[PDB]
């Protein structure tokens, strides 16, 4: 439908822009962990990842509320829920990596949630492009 297609193309463009900020924040986060930075540093970078990814959750929320097509609503609500779940996972594992610092396993858990977030957000964007086509 016309209104859905226009909505999707528009928010695909916004998603692509926000994905840039997220990639920079995730990269910076990985670099912090790879140079063995302490909690005052990697906890800050965690917050940057969360804030920038939350922009994509919000796009999903906005899109899902206004899309007419059942399959569009379904897919975008899935990714909004999935990304929201992963953000809580990042808050949880970051706190645990700080509380147990220095712990290589705690840090790898945190790193894994952030990696999964990176993958899932890229996948969200891919699906928007597919829906818009």
């Amino acid at each position: 439908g016309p209104s859905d297609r226009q909505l999707l193309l528009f928010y695909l463009e916004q998603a692509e822009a926000n994905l840039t900020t997220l990639t920079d924040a995730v990269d910076a986060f990985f670099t912090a962990v790879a140079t063995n930075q302490p909690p005052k540093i990697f906890v800050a970078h965690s917050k940057f990842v969360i804030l920038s990814a939350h922009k994509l959750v919000f796009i999903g929320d906005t899109l899902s509320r206004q899309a007419k097509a059942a399959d569009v609503r379904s897919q975008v609500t899935h990714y909004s829920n999935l990304l929201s779940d992963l953000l809580r996972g990042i808050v949880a594992t970051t706190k645990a990596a700080a509380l147990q610092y220095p712990s290589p396993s705690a840090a790898q858990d945190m790193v894994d949630r952030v990696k999964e977030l990176g993958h899932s957000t890229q996948q969200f964007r891919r699906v928007l492009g597919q829906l818009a086509a």
Binding site: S46, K47, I50, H54, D61, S84, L87, R88
Partner: peptide
Amino acid sequence: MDDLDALLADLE
């Protein structure tokens, strides 16, 4: 979707 201010607050 959660409130962003609340997620950040829990790391602060």
